[PDB]
């Protein structure tokens, strides 16, 4: 039939977009998920285009 799966209804776990470690925090500015203040420090001073790449690694985008 070639139509053959559906999304899960379970809530997904949250991982840091940078280091992949678990992420308690979601940055409201760039919407990257991050592990700790050390990674937040690099996120907020990323080269301007890089934020969309960390999203795109999980298929997320601003648009």
């Amino acid at each position: 039939t070639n139509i053959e799966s559906a999304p899960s209804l379970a809530p997904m776990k949250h991982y840091c977009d940078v280091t992949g470690l678990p992420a308690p925090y979601l940055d409201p500015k760039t919407r990257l998920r991050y592990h700790n203040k050390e990674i937040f420090a690099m996120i907020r001073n990323l080269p301007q285009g890089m934020g969309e790449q960390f999203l795109e690694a999980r298929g997320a985008h601003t648009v």
Partner: protein, 443 residues
């Protein structure tokens, strides 16, 4: 503050060399009483060491010889690490409970259960709160929080949105959230948002934003007494009786169950047991029924060390009609070692008066200190210590910057010592009401 200057306020500890238990001639506010301070330090060591259970120590000596001061010095040199219960023996004559029950509760208060636990606490400044309240309420909402090091946004579950609205949490508020309970404490208002707080009056304080991670595990080390566990288990709000009183006589089978459970927690390693001290001030106010209970209460494994002070000589035991040393029955005195306090020498009185003149904001001229020392020898340490306050108040009436002999002389003249008070009584026996009820009111 709310602590005023009081008779023991100068006692900061026991004044003993911790490396050797050698008492220093003076330190930490204790003067002399060296052998008694050494013995109290040996008791202090085995209190901290915990391995020894249910020993009773009596401190015996004339009034004003530092018995309470040594008791206060031990309490100050144990601190929070060990439960310290102070009981005036007058206190157990309750109308709510029998005196052996009151005396049981005092022993139970003196053993701590130390329980070590963690929680994740989230703390920071609220950047904003959105709650839709979509008729209806608490449907959905987002929370932004920052420290100085991080900012994060959270979707809130509905029972958290109730908590936020219950605490009227607002942009700029510095909050802690305990996650597992979900209680919110507003630690303060952030200074940067001060302009927003138009309803807050100018008396309002403000704070700097928190620092570090928004979330961390903070470990709390609770210590809860056996008495508190006993009272908690009495009724559906048993703890509420830990404040108002109105505990009954707690049933023995409740205590016996709790002792078994606390032995389980110890063996399971979930809790430590922390033996404290019960200090019974003026233990001779107890009666013969009390001493009989104490004798076997001390044989319990979960007994504190009991420390006791008595003024009394060979004196009538209460609740009977015969006399014994300290007013304590010999069968009880068989279970007790005794520390003696001696009277002070004139230089020790001078030093105690000096210390008391440091704790009170008083300047004594050297001749005023010499006169108070002489008065202390003649009229007792306590009376000369009460002349210190009196002399400062008289000096301030004459606007003097230092207390002079004139002020001490006015004090001695205005306020009688016990001996002159007795002599006044022994002269006024016709004007004072006698033990016969007889009195003459005529001139």
């Amino acid at each position: 503050g709310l602590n005023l200057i009081a008779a023991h306020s100068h006692i900061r500890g026991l004044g003993v060399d911790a490396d050797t238990l050698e008492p220093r001639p003076s330190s930490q506010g204790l003067v002399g009483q060296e052998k008694a301070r050494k013995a109290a330090a040996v008791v202090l060591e085995m209190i901290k060491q915990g391995k020894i259970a249910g020993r009773a120590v009596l401190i015996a000596g004339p009034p004003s010889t530092g018995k309470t001061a040594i008791a206060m010095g031990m309490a100050q040199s144990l601190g929070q690490d060990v439960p310290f219960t102070t009981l005036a023996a007058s206190e157990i004559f309750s109308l709510e409970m029998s005196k052996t029950e009151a005396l049981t509760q005092a022993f139970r208060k003196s053993i701590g259960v130390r329980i070590k636990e963690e929680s994740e606490i989230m703390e920071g400044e609220v950047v904003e709160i959105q709650i839709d309240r979509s008729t209806g309420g608490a449907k959905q909402g987002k929370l932004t929080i920052k420290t100085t090091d991080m900012e994060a946004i959270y979707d809130m579950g509905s029972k958290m949105i109730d908590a936020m609205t219950k605490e009227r949490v607002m942009a700029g508020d510095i909050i802690s959230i305990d996650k597992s309970s979900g209680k919110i404490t507003k630690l303060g208002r952030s200074y940067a948002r001060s302009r927003d707080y138009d309803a807050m009056g100018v008396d309002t304080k403000f704070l700097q934003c928190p620092e570090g991670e928004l979330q961390k595990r903070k470990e709390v080390v609770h210590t809860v007494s056996l008495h508190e566990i006993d009272v908690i288990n009495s009724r559906t709000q048993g703890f509420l009786a830990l404040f108002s009183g109105d505990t009954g006589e707690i049933r023995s089978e409740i205590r016996d169950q709790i002792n078994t459970k606390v032995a389980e927690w110890k063996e399971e390693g979930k809790a430590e047991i922390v033996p404290g001290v019960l200090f019974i001030d003026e233990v001779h106010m107890l009666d013969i029924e009390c001493f009989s209970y104490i004798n076997r209460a001390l044989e319990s494994d979960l007994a504190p060390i009991v420390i006791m002070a008595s003024n009394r000589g060979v004196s009538r035991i209460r609740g009977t009609d015969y006399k014994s040393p300290h007013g304590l029955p010999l069968d009880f005195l068989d279970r007790v070692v005794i520390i003696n306090t001696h009277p002070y020498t004139p230089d020790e009185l001078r030093q105690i008066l000096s210390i008391r003149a440091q704790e009170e904001e008083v300047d004594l001229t050297p001749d005023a200190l010499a006169l108070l020392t002489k008065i202390g020898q003649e009229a007792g340490l306590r009376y000369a210590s009460n002349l210190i306050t009196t002399s400062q108040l008289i000096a301030a009436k004459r606007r003097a910057k230092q207390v002079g002999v004139e002020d001490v002389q006015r004090s001695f003249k205005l306020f009688y010592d016990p001996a002159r008070s007795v002599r006044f009584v022994q002269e006024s026996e016709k004007r004072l009401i006698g033990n016969d009820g007889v009195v003459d009111f005529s001139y």
